[PDB]
Tab-separated table of C-alpha atoms and ligand atoms in Angstrom:
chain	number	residue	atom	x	y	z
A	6	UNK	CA	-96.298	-2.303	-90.407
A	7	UNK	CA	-95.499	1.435	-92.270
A	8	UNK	CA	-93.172	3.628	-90.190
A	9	UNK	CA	-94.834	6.449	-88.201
A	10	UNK	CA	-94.589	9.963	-89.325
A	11	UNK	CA	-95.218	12.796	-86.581
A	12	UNK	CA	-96.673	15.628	-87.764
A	13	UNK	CA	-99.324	18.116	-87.961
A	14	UNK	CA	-99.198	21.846	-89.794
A	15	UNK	CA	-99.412	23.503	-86.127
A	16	UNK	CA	-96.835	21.158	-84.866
A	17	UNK	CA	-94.270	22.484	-87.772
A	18	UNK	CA	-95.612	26.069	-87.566
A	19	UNK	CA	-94.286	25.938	-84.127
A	20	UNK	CA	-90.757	23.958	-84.840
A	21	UNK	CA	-90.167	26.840	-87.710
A	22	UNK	CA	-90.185	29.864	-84.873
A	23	UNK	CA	-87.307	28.108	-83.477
A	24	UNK	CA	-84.716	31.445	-84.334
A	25	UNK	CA	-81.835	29.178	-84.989
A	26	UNK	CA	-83.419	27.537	-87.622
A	27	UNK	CA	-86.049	29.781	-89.341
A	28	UNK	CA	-88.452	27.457	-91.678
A	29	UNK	CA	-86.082	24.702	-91.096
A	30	UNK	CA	-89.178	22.117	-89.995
A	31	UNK	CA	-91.304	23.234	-93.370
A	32	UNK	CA	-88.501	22.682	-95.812
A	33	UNK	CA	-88.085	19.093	-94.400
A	34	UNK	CA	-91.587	18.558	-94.670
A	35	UNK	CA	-92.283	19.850	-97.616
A	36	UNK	CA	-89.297	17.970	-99.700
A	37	UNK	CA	-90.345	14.525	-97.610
A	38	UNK	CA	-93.964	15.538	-99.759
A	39	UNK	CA	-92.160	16.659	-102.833
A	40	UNK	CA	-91.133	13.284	-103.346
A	41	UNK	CA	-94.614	11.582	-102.044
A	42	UNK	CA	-92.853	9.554	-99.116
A	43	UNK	CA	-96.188	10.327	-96.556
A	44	UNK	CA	-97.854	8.689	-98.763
A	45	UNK	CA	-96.209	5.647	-97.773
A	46	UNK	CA	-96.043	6.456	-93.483
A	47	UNK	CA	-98.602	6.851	-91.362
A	48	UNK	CA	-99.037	10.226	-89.987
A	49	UNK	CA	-100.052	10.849	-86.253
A	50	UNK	CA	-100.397	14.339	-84.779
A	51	UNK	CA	-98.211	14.784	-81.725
A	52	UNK	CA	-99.310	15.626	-78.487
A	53	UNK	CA	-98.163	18.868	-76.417
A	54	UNK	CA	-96.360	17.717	-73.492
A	55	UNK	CA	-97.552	18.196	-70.207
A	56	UNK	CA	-95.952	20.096	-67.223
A	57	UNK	CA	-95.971	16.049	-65.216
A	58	UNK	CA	-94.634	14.513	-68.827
A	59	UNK	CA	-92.100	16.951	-68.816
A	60	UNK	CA	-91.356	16.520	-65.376
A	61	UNK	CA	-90.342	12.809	-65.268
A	62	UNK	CA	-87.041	14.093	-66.187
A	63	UNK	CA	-87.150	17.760	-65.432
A	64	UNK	CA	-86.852	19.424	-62.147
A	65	UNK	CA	-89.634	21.406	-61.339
A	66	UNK	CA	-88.439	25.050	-60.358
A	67	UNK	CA	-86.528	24.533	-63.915
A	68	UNK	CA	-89.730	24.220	-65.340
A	69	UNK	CA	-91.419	26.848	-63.801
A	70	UNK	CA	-88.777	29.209	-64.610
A	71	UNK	CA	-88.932	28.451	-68.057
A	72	UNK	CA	-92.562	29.191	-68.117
A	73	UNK	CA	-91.993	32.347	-66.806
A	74	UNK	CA	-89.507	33.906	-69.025
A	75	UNK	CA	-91.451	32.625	-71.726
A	76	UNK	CA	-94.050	35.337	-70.809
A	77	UNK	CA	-91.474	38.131	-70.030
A	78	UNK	CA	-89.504	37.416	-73.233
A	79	UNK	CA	-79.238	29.564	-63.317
A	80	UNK	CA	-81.043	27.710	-65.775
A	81	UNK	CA	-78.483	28.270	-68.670
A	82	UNK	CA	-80.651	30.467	-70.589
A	83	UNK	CA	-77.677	32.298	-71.915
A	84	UNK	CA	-76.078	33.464	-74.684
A	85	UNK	CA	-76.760	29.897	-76.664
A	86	UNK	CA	-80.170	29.893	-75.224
A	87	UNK	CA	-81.667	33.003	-75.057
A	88	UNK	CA	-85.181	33.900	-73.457
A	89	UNK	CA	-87.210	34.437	-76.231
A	90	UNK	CA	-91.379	34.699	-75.859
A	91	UNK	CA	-92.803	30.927	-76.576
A	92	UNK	CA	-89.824	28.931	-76.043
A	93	UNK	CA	-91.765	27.136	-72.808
A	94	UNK	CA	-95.071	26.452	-75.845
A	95	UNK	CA	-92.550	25.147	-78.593
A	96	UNK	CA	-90.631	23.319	-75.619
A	97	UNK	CA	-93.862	21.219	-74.758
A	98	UNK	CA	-95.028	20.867	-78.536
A	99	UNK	CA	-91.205	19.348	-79.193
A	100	UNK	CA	-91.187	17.382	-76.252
A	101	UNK	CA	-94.950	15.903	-76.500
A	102	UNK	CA	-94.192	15.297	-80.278
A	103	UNK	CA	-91.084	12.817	-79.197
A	104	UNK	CA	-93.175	11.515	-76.473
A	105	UNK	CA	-96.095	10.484	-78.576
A	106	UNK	CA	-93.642	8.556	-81.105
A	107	UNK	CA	-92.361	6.657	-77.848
A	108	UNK	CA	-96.180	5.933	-77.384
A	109	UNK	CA	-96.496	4.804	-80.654
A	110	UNK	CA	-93.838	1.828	-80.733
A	111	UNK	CA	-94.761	0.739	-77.253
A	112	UNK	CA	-98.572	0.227	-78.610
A	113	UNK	CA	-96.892	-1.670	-81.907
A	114	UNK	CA	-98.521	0.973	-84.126
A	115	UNK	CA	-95.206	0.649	-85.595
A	116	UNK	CA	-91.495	-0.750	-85.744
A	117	UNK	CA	-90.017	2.810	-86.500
A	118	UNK	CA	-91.442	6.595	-85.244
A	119	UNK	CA	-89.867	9.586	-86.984
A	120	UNK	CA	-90.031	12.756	-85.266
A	121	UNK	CA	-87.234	14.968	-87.503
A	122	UNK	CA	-88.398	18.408	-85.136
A	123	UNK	CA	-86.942	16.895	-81.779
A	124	UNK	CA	-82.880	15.723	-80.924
A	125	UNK	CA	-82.463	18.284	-78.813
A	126	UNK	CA	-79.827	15.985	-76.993
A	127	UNK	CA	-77.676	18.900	-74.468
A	128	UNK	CA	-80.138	19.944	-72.234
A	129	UNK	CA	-79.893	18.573	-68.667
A	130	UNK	CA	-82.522	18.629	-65.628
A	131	UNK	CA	-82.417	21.663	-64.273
A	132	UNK	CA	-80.585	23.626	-67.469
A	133	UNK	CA	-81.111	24.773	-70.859
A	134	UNK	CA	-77.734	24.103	-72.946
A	135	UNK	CA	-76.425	24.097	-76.538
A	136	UNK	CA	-80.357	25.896	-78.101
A	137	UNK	CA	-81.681	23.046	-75.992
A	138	UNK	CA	-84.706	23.807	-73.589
A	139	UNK	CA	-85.691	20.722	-72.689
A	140	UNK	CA	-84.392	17.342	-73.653
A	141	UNK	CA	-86.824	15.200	-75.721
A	142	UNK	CA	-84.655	12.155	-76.256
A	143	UNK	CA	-84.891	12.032	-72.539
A	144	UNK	CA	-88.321	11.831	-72.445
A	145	UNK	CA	-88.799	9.570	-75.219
A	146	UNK	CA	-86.127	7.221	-73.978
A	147	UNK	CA	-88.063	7.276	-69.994
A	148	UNK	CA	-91.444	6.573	-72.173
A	149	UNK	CA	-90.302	3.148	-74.154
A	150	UNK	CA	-88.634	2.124	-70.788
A	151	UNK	CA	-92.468	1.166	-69.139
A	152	UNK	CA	-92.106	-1.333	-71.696
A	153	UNK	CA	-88.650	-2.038	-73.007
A	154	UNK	CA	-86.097	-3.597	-70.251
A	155	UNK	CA	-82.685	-2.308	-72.225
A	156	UNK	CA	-82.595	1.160	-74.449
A	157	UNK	CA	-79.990	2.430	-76.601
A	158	UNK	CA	-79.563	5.730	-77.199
A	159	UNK	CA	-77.225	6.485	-80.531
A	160	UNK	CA	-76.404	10.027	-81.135
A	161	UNK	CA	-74.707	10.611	-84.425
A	162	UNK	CA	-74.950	14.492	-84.342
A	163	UNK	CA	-71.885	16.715	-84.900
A	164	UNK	CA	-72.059	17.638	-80.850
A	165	UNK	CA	-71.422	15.140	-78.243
A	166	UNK	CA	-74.743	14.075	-76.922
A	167	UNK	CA	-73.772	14.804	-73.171
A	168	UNK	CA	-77.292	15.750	-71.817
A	169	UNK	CA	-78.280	12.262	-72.808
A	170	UNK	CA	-75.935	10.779	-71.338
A	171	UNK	CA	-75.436	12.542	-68.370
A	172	UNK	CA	-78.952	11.919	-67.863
A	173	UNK	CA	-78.001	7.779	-67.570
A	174	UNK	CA	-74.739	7.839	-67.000
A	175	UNK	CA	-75.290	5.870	-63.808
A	176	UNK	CA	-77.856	3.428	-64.997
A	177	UNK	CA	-76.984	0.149	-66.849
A	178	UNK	CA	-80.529	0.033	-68.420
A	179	UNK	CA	-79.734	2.333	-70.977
A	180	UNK	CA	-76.643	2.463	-72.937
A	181	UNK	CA	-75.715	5.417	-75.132
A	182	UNK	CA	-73.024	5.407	-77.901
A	183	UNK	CA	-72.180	9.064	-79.385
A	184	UNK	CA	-69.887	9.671	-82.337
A	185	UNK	CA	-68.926	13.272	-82.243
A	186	UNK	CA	-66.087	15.785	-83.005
A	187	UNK	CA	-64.177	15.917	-80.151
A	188	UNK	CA	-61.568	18.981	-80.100
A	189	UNK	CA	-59.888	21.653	-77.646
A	190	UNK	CA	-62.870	24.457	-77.416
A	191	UNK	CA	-65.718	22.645	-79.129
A	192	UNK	CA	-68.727	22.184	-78.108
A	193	UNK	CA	-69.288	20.841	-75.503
A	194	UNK	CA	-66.183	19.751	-74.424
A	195	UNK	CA	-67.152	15.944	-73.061
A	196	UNK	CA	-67.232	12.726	-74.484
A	197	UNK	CA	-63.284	11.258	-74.786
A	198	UNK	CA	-63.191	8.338	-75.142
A	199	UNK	CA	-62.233	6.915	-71.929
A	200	UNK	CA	-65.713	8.734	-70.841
A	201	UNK	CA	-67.630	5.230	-69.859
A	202	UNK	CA	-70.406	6.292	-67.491
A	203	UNK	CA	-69.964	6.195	-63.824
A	204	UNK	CA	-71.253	3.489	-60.886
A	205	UNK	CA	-73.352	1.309	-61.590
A	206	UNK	CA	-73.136	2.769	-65.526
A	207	UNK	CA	-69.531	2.126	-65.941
A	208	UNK	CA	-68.857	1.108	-69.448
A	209	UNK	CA	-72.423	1.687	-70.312
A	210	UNK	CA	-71.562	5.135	-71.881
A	211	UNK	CA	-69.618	4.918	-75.072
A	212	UNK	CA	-68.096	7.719	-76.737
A	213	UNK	CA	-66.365	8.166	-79.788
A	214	UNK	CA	-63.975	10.739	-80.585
A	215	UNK	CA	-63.658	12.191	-84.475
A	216	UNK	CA	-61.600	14.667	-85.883
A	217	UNK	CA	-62.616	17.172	-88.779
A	218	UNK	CA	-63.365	15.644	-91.978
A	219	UNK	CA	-64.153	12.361	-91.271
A	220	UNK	CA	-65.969	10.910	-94.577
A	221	UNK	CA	-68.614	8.759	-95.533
A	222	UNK	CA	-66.430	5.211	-95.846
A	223	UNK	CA	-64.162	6.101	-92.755
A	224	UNK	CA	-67.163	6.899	-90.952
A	225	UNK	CA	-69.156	3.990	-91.616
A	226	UNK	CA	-66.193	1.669	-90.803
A	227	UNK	CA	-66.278	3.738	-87.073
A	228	UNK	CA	-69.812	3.260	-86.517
A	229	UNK	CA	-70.197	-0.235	-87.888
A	230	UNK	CA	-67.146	-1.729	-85.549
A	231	UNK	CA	-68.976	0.280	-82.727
A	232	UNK	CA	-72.383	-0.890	-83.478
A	233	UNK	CA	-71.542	-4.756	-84.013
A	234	UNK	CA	-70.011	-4.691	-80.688
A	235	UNK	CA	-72.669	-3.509	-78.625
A	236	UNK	CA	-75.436	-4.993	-80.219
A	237	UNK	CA	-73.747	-8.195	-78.965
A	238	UNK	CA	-72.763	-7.051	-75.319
A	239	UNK	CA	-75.852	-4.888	-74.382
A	240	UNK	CA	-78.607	-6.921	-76.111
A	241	UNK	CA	-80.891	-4.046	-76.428
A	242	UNK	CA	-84.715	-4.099	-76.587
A	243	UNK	CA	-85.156	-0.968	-78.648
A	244	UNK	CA	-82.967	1.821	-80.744
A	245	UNK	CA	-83.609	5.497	-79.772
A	246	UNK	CA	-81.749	7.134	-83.083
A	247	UNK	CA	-80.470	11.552	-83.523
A	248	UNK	CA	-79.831	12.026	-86.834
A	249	UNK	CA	-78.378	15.730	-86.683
A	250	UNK	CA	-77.223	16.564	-89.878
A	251	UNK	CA	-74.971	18.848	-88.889
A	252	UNK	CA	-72.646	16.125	-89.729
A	253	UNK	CA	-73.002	16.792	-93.388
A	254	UNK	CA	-70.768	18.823	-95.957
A	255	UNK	CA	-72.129	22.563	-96.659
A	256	UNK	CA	-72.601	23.073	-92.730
A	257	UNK	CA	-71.352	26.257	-91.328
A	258	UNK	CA	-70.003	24.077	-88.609
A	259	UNK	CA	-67.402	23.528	-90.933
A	260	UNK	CA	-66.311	20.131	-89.403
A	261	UNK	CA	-67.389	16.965	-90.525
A	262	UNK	CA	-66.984	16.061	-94.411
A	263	UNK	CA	-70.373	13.470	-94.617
A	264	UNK	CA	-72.603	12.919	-97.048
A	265	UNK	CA	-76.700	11.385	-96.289
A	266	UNK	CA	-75.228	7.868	-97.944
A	267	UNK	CA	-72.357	7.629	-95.330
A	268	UNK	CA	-74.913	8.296	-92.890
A	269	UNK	CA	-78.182	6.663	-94.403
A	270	UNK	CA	-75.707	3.070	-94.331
A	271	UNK	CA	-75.319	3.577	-90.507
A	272	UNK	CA	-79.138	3.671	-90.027
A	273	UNK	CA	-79.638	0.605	-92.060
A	274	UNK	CA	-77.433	-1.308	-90.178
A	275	UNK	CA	-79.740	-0.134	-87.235
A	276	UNK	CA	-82.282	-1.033	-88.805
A	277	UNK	CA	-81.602	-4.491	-89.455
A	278	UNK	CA	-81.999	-5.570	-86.258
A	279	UNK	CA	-85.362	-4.942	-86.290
A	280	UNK	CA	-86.127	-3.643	-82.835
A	281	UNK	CA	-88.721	-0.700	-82.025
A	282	UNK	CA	-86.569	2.372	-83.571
A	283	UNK	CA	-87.537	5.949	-82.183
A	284	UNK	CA	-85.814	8.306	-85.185
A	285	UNK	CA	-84.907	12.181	-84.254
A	286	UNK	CA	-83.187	15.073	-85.676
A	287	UNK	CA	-81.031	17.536	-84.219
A	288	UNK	CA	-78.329	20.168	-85.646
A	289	UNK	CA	-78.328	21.207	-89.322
A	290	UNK	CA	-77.733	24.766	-89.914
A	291	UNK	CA	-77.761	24.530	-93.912
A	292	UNK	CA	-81.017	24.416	-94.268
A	293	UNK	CA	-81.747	22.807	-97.518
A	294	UNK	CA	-78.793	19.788	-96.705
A	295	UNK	CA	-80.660	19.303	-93.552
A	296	UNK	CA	-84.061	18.678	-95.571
A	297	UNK	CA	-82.042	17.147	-98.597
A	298	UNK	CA	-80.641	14.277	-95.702
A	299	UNK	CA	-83.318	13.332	-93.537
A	300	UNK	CA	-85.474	13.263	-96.575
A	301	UNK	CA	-82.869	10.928	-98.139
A	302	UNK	CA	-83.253	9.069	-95.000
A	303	UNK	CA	-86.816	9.026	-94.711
A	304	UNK	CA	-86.268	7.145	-98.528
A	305	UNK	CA	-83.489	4.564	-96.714
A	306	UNK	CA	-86.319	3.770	-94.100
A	307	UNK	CA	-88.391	2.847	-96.288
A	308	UNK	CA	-86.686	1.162	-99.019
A	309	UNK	CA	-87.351	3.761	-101.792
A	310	UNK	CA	-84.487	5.154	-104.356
A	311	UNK	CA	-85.895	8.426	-104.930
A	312	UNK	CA	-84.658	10.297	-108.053
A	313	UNK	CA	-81.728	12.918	-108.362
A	314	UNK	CA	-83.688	15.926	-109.400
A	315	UNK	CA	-85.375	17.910	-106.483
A	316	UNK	CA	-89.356	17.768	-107.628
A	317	UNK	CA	-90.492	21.462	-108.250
A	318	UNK	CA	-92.727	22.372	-104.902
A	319	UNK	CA	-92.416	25.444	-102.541
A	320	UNK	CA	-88.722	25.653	-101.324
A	321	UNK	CA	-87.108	24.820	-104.802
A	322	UNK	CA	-85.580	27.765	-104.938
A	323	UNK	CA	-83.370	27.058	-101.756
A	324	UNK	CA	-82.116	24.067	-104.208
A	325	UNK	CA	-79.963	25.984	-106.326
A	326	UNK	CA	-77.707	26.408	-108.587
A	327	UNK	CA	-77.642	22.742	-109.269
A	328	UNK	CA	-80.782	21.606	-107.830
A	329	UNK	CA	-79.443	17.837	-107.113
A	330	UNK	CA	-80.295	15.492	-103.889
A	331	UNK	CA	-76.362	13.864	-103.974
A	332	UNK	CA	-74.185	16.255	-101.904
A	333	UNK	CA	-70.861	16.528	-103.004
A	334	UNK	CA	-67.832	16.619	-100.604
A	335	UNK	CA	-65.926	19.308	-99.692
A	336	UNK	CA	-62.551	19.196	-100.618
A	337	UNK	CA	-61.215	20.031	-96.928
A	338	UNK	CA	-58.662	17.494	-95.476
A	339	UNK	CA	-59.549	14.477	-93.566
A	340	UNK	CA	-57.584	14.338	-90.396
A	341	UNK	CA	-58.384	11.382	-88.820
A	342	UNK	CA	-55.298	9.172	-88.519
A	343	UNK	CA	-55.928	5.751	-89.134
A	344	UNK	CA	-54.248	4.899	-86.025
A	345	UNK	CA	-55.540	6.900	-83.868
A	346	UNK	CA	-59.397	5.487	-85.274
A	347	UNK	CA	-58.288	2.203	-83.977
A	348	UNK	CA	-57.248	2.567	-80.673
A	349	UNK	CA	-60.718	3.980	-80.094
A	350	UNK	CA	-62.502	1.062	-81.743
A	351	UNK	CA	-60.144	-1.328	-79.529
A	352	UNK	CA	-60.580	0.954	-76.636
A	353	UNK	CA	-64.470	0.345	-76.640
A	354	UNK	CA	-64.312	-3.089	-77.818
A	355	UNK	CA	-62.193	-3.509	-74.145
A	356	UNK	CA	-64.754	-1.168	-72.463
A	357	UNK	CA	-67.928	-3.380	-73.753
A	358	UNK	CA	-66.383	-6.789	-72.789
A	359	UNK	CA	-67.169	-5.533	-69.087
A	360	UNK	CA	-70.457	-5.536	-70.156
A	361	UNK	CA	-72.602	-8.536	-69.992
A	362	UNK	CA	-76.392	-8.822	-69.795
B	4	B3N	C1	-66.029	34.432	-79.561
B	4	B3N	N1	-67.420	34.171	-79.168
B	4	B3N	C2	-68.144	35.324	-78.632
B	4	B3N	C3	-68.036	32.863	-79.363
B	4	B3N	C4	-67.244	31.732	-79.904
B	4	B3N	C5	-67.824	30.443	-80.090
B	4	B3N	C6	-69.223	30.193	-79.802
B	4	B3N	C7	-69.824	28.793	-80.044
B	4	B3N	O1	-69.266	27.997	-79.817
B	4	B3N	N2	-71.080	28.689	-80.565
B	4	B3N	C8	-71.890	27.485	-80.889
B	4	B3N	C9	-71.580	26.202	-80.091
B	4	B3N	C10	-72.875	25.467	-79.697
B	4	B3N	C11	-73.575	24.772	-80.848
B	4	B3N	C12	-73.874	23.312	-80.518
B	4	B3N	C13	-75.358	23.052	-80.737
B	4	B3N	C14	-75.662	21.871	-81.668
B	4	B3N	O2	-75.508	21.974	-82.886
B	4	B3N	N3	-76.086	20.723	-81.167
B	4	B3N	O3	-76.313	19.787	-81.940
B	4	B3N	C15	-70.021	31.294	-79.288
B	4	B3N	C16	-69.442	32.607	-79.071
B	5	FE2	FE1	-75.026	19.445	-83.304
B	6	K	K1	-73.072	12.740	-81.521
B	7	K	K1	-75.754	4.488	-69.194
């Protein structure tokens, strides 16, 4: 049956206030309708997220701080998450929109739910982290567990997906696999590769680490070996999927060297298995690569080859001067030894033997 689209104009009105990426959720939109693709999904409107819903992962004075400040204008609302008016209202509306796509694979609307506004993978319980208030893959992945027995979580942002996986990092019912840079001083910090969970979640946290300018074919290879493995070990009963495209050349984190192929041939491979498939966002702070990928990816998912040109529509102008889909790489060097790349794979493929179902 056609893959789920979450959406509604209020729902985007309210992702585009988010200050660190101004209009962000209407250029996505509007280039996924540019090329006609919700035509082809079905399109539910998500649901705000209630202060219970929000709870069954965050702790309750957190909550209830966050609602406060969010009238005033130790819950990490710092520097990288400022107290801004509304964040507690676009909180909710992110969290209830990730939360109804986890409602609508467990009622087999659907074998795939895209929410592209939610990924907000750092925050933790009780803190806001990383321009994360509350952490909707969380939710999502506690909502498909009432009726999936094994969950994995794969976070193929730029940042290390450490709110996730803190959050389960001593359960063996969900296993989450990150690929992230992994450097002295970068954000945030975790996610080595001999991270593997801890108790009764040993080995069912997989992380790997990637220098700058890792490319589309190296990449692949990475996620592929990665994948293969713990499809086979964990057996899981449905994919929760971040997409943050923050990953992809032209970002001003200046670290990856991807392109939306390199990354559109990972979700494939996800998608082959055919399991329920809850797809999120994330990072992307060029804001017309951000829309140019995930639409590209909202083509891979469903089997479309959409055309080179960006179709005329509202944001065209952000398109230019070439006005092209295919994003070129950046000639920055790639320095990822091939070595080093497969210790890690043999590293994991060690970890994952420990686990069996
Ligand atoms: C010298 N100075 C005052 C600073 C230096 C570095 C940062 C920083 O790391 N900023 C951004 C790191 C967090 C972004 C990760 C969020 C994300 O994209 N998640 O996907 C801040 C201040
Ligand atoms: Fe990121
Ligand atoms: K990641
Ligand atoms: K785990």
């Amino acid at each position: 049956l056609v893959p789920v689209y979450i959406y509604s104009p209020e729902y985007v009105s309210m992702c585009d206030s988010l200050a660190k990426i101004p209009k962000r959720a209407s250029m996505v939109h509007s280039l996924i309708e540019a090329y006609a693709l919700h035509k082809q999904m079905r399109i539910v409107k998500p649901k705000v997220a209630s202060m219970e819903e929000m709870a069954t992962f965050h702790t309750d004075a957190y909550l209830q701080h966050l609602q406060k400040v969010s009238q005033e204008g130790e819950y990490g609302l710092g520097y990288l998450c400022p107290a801004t008016e509304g964040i507690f209202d676009y909180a909710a509306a992110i969290g209830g929109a990730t939360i109804t796509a986890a409602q609508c694979l467990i009622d087999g609307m659907c074998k795939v739910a895209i929410n592209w506004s939610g990924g907000w993978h750092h925050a933790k319980k009780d803190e806001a982290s990383g321009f994360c208030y509350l952490n909707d893959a969380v939710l999502g992945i506690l909502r498909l567990r009432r009726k999936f027995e094994r969950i994995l979580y794969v976070d193929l942002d730029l940042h290390h997906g450490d709110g996730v996986e803190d959050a389960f990092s001593f359960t063996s019912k969900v296993m989450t696999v990150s690929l992230h840079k992994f450097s002295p001083g970068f954000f945030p910090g975790t996610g080595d590769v001999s991270d593997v969970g801890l108790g009764k979640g040993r080995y069912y946290s997989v992380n790997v680490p990637i220098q700058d300018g890792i490319q589309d074919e190296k990449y692949y290879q990475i996620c592929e070996s990665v994948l293969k493995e713990v499809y086979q070990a964990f057996n899981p009963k449905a994919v929760v999927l971040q997409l943050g495209a923050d990953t992809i050349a032209g970002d001003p984190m200046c670290s990856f060297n991807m392109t939306p192929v390199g990354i559109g041939k990972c979700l494939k491979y996800i998608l082959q298995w055919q399991l329920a498939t809850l797809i999120l966002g994330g990072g992307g702070y060029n804001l017309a690569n951000t829309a140019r990928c995930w639409t590209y990816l909202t083509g891979v998912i469903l089997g479309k080859t959409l055309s080179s040109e960006i179709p005329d529509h509202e944001f065209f102008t952000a398109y230019g001067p070439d006005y092209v889909l295919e994003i070129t790489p950046s000639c920055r060097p790639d320095r990822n030894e091939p070595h080093r790349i497969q210790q890690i794979l043999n590293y994991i493929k060690g970890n994952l033997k420990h686990v069996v179902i």
